[PDB]
Design a protein around this ligand. Structure first.
Ligand code: HEM
Ligand code: HEM
Ligand code: HEM
Ligand code: HEM
Ligand SMILES: [Mg+2]
Ligand SMILES: [Mg+2]
Ligand SMILES: [O]
Ligand SMILES: [O]
Ligand SMILES: [O]
Ligand SMILES: [O]
Ligand SMILES: [O]
Ligand SMILES: [O]
Lengths: 306, 306, 305, 306, 306, 305
């Protein structure tokens, strides 16, 4: 391998997602920060070892890549593609840099975010900042366990990391982010059994519904994709609840990593545009995407050498 | 004894502070929720025992008290008093109800806040919502250990709980809240030694500066007050950092509990108005108060039985 | 003065319940063991501190009391009273001694149970032995959080420990046990909403149903009792799941402590015999009691002599 | 690689061992369950991460293999061989399927066992169910540390997983189970020094007795086997105490995994039939085997693909 | 009314014992430090709450008391009494102040010791400094569990804290310290059963030997004392192992607290001078006392008010 | 070849034991070396997985020649004394090193007891230090210590002998120095002055920028690049130790590297200085009182003796 960033993190219960745009003239300041971001991760995190589990994954957008870097582009990097479905829309929103910061406690996330943004002041403009927290039994804001079918170990490495198909960028990955807000009032008007039909798994025990009962427009049915090879196409998700009680914002911050964006984009087309047997993913009847961006997260060595 | 609310909580690393006003017509909804708030605390918290340490302290303001209840008022209950000092101002901002929610994890705080506000929908208007997190060494946003000299055990009970001086309301307490925003750029331009002179304690080791070196306008000097008998008057604090890196908000949410507000108000007068030997508390040269409210937090029995 | 047994235990995730009868001639062996049981608790448990949280509460039944001791009896001690309801029955089964052993791990429970039974070999006959395990989010075998409305702190002391009303036995408590087996197939055929109507609380979030929607024959409705002065009568429970997948046994081991058995017995009458507005507790349509016994758990000093 | 099942588990303190036979006509129900058992493991276990450490290893017996599958058999799969020694006997008892379920808590084991047996109701007959619990300092029912000389890391992989010698079944393993009941009264009548001579290690400190003093009929002496090439032959064990105090049952559930059964079978021959210098393993004078079965535990991918 | 020092500490796994003498002219420096030692405990310890469990118990010797204070002496305060037995001797060694520092980690103990000695250098001379550590499952250097029969809860308060018999000093306690070195070679030449006869309990399981078998010169037999009224006389011990492998020092640091020194001194007389049935405590055939001192540990408010 | 546990997880306790081999002690030593891994498992297994007990064993240059014949590791020599204009790095005797680490001191002490028990009468102790982690990975100067250590594959590549010395692949070279600090002098500096000595910020552990980091700061002098532009790295696991009564406050330095050339270059820069720096400022507050070099062989080398 070249050394990947910490895309495959242990379970962490806190996150900060920071998305910024690079102002005109900001490119040199950004390049300096990229070359120091691993040492800032160690400076904030080392003293909290081994419990802290602080990591920062840094992603670069398609248009930003062109402004920052001389030569070859990762093969799969392009701007997030808007999906204009008959009912639901996946919007594309601006984002040049993503900082996906995770730890076992929010203070470490905040301290590293503070240091990063300290160095970028005056060169970037914030577009989104989300402080995420996991519910205690890995549940999301709809009350379902979230993460169960993620790949593990070698299967995860194979699904997420660029390899010999794009060898200059081996050890990188592609991240898609979407901020979702939920209509909790509508969702809580459904019976548990109806909610289970939307997701495709049992609510309390997290057991998958059998094939003879699982609806075609359930979330699990539409995000299960088989390749030309007969095998399952997989992504790695680390979705985080977030919100504000006073503003009635109850949200899921979606982030999905894959070795090529084609996998993630196929899942999204199935959700928003539907299939022969399904108009769209029923989860979107209770979830509105308000952001959407695509980033390439290079190997750690790529960033160190700038 | 009457049973107090959990004013004396173990150390907790997450908090939500929620301040609301009661809309016209909302009184009955509020009264029903007050009588169930302890059972909601158990419902959300029990399943995460014993680690969760979830508690909710509920407080009621002076004007709200008159709307909700007839009969006796707590003796010390009045609206927060604005302090218009020569340089610094402590503002008074609206607030009828305070929910001070603490736990070892933010998700438990959020779940209980969701249930409370779900019951109050349409009866209240949010005025402030802060999600606080402790730094890993009990440090605040200025980098100093925060909480060291709080009383514990019997001394804490005696300092915070109403007793025989107002026997109908024994087991209650008075809470003062202020949200502070910091000028971190200015603060970080001071040397550590200069910062220690502002606070009155050593930064790294948290040892109090000796009397011959501690300035009269240091925070510790001005918030040390002795009563008629030569003994120290004490409060119980549970200050929490909060912020947003994109908006450059770095904050301390102050909350102080005492058996009478006179103690807390004396400290505030010294800080903001100054004394013969100190113009004002030097901490205020790096900290701006943007809210200020006073609440009475009744004994748990009072809330149950109405 | 008097030091209670560890009736008010922290949360523990494992338990052994051991119920035995005292054979003819076994009384002296039992009395010797009773005077050592606290030192055995420390011998097994001290070295596992502070995580182990091992405790043993020892209880004595009404007929056994008369065999072991003379002089005063605790005022409330009597044999468990069978309830023959129109549909459901609460049976009374034999039991002279109860050992309620709790810890954070089953091995510690087993080690202490081994030492106790080692000393009693030849003097007692086992009637029941159950190895209990709590589910990770304090849920029981029916999938509901179990323990939520137990009293804590001073309210628990006042609800569970004998005081001035029976001063020779102050610091004791009364334990009722029942082993329940559940019909899981029937239970799992209910919707979540229907299950919530049986219990009286929401399944996922454990919030109580409001008074206007909570059925009168729900478990929470029928086990809520007010005394003459309008205040709530409370007990302290530490129900444990148990079972065997091969034998299709899925169970709840009920144990309830109270300062007088009258409180517990009133709750049982409401559950099994009903009220004006409820035929019986709906939980009994999925739960069958196969044991029932009542014990007095004396203050620890009483056993030390 | 093919992905093995979780044969190499971290240390776990609870286990359920389930052995069943497949009834007439049960094969289709069994095959459906085998293809879902990994997803049931994730459903029950994921929400209890990372503490839960729940895993399930599934094994299939010799006769069962031929009912369930056609095509190739694993090279070493055969029925457990009875050893009818001069004094001690290793019995064979029926078993078609083994579920070896491990976790940090018994409730998780029980939850997974419930789901598995729920799917098999009416297709299988239970033969054994044991609920195992480790003592707090990794001791067994005889009071000795149990596990010390198990191989770890690469050496464990090499000792336990089928490789190139049987390439269609690479990543599988062979499990032998025997339920032992102990005569605790006899064992406790020995002095500690006498017990140490039976095992071959010091009781309190777990230091191996030196070669000059360790008896030839000690457990450690007889279960140390060198292969023709001079190297040590190793197995991976995860022995678990179990019992019932009322019934006076105090037991060790032996389970041993190896890349070929010949290793485990050689150890058993030495124990039960003896060597030139040793009549039999002295541990058998305090331990009686009441079950005995042999299973092949295939690679996880083999089961997924049915 | 009066607040004791933290004599009744939870279990802690590290300790520092510091014994010093007060130099001529050092009395004022010592008195200033005594009035600040609680503040220093908070300064070092607060930031590690709630896990740190740092406490310092401060004790004052008989001759030192007369140098530091005038007015009343505690009734039981006198210099440690040498016991010159036929075989074994309990020596009296100098000591004016004791600092018994405990925590869950050594660094906190060391940090507090550093602050205390920083204030006292030039006023005191160190006589003994021991760094103690917990050894396995509450075992001492002889391999036995140590602390099992300590009193707990109310019984501990009644055994350890001065009350109405000496009301000016209520809430204080008396501490006896003796540093013991062990002859490990001799001890390890005994069989386990012989060691159990020295101590009076079983080694592995820590079960007390029955009255039928417990020798009269066992440690447990000689340290069990009943008062005139038939009740047990109890002390609270927190013995700590210490040592150095290269110097062959394997030690037990004995510390025992009691409401009057007569209880502790009776136990010592039984051990060193014997009874009608026992020449001396057999533990002394493997344990040599090289220090011995007695201190009064005043209530915390006594020290605060100087 | 399997290396010893040079790359350990973070551990909060250590014992460092340095001994010399007495005349005639060689065979006793060789027998112990072949059992040291077994002893590590025996003491450690029962505390897994929290214990994290490990022992790295090293052999000095003169000792190697007494114990073994044939080929020697290419870089093995006695520690080289550095006589700088102001500061001196002394060389002190040491034939064997036992670097014992765990999450608790008792495990370290138990293993050290067993090892020294086997060597009684064959070795003489030279140094014994019981180290403890201080707060949030701080050292006795109050700075975080460990931050820039390599991790993962970069660590393996920096510390383990490979194809450059193939007979000894999987080994490493350990340099030890016991340092005592003059804390009174150090505490007379302002925080900003202390930061200029180390080259990082005290509270936040952020490296000073290149425009403000002095040339004689510790971080500046211990940053070394090879001819090909790459960083030359070592693995450190420095441990505080001390005694408050004697006013001894120390750092026990241990540095592992695939060749002693890397470590020795750093030492020369610290003690003898460069074109732009007289010496490492940290040495104005730190005195070395021991210095030894050891080769830590691959685990299989020791097993096969
Ligand atoms: C509102 C946003 C979302 C919510 C609340 C949500 C929630 C969930 C839940 C509860 C599961 C079942 C448990 C699990 O396997 O993790 C799940 C599975 C999944 N979700 Fe989502 N999800 C969201 C958005 C998305 C999006 C946008 C994608 C893809 C672009 C996606 C892809 C998946 C995939 C691949 C799985 C696993 C299906 C399988 O193989 O079983 N999800 N999600
Ligand atoms: C920006 C707002 C504030 C910050 C960052 C802050 C921070 C601190 C810190 C770092 C200490 C020293 C350690 C400790 O004993 O907790 C302290 C002490 C204290 N603070 Fe504040 N504080 C703030 C506002 C206030 C206010 C508004 C009051 C009172 C109305 C107050 C009352 C106290 C008191 C009573 C002490 C204890 C002093 C003593 O007896 O030693 N604080 N504060
Ligand atoms: C009868 C119940 C059993 C008990 C209580 C038991 C217990 C033990 C104990 C205490 C040890 C020493 C520490 C260690 O785990 O390394 C051990 C070692 C071992 N046992 Fe057993 N054992 C049993 C049956 C068996 C069986 C049936 C086999 C093989 C079929 C076996 C194979 C081994 C092996 C290979 C070792 C390691 C030997 C070595 O040191 O290299 N055990 N056992
Ligand atoms: C005298 C006692 C010593 C102390 C207290 C000490 C302390 C420190 C501290 C605080 C750092 C910065 C944080 C870190 O990266 O660890 C550091 C870095 C370092 N020290 Fe030391 N050190 C000492 C001796 C030595 C010696 C003798 C050497 C080498 C032979 C050395 C080599 C290093 C190296 C290589 C770094 C990392 C530099 C970088 O690339 O950033 N240290 N030390
Ligand atoms: Mg002196
Ligand atoms: Mg000095
Ligand atoms: O998802
Ligand atoms: O404060
Ligand atoms: O219950
Ligand atoms: O074994
Ligand atoms: O003791
Ligand atoms: O270092």
């Amino acid at each position: 391998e070249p050394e990947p960033q910490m895309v495959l993190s242990p379970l962490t219960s806190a996150a900060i997602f920071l998305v910024v745009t690079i102002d005109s003239g900001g490119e040199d300041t950004v390049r300096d920060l990229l070359s120091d971001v691993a040492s800032l991760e160690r400076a904030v995190g080392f003293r909290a070892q081994p419990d802290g589990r602080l990591s920062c994954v840094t992603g670069i957008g398609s248009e930003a890549w062109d402004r920052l870097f001389s030569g070859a582009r990762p093969a799969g990097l392009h701007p997030f593609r808007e999906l204009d479905g008959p009912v639901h829309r996946a919007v594309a929103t601006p984002g040049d840099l993503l900082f996906h910061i995770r730890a076992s406690r929010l203070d470490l996330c905040f301290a590293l975010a503070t240091e990063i943004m300290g160095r970028l002041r005056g060169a970037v403009t914030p577009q989104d900042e989300v402080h995420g927290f996991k519910y205690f039994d890995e549940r999301d804001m709809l009350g379902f366990v979230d993460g169960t079918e993620n790949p593990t170990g070698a299967a995860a490495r194979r699904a997420v990391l660029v390899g010999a198909e794009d060898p200059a960028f081996a050890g990188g990955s592609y991240a898609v982010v979407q901020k979702y807000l939920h209509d909790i009032d509508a969702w809580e008007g459904l019976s548990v059994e109806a909610q289970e039909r939307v997701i495709g798994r049992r609510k309390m025990t997290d057991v998958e519904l059998s094939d003879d009962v699982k609806p075609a427009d359930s979330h699990v049915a539409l995000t299960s994709v088989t390749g030309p090879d007969g095998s399952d196409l997989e992504i790695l998700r680390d979705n985080m609840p977030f919100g504000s009680v006073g503003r009635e914002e109850f949200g899921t911050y979606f982030i999905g990593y894959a070795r090529t964006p084609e996998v993630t984009e196929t899942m999204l087309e199935r959700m928003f545009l539907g299939t022969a047997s399904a108009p769209h993913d029923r989860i979107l009847d209770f979830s509105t995407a308000v952001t959407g961006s695509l980033f390439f997260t290079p190997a750690a060595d790529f960033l160190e050498d700038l």
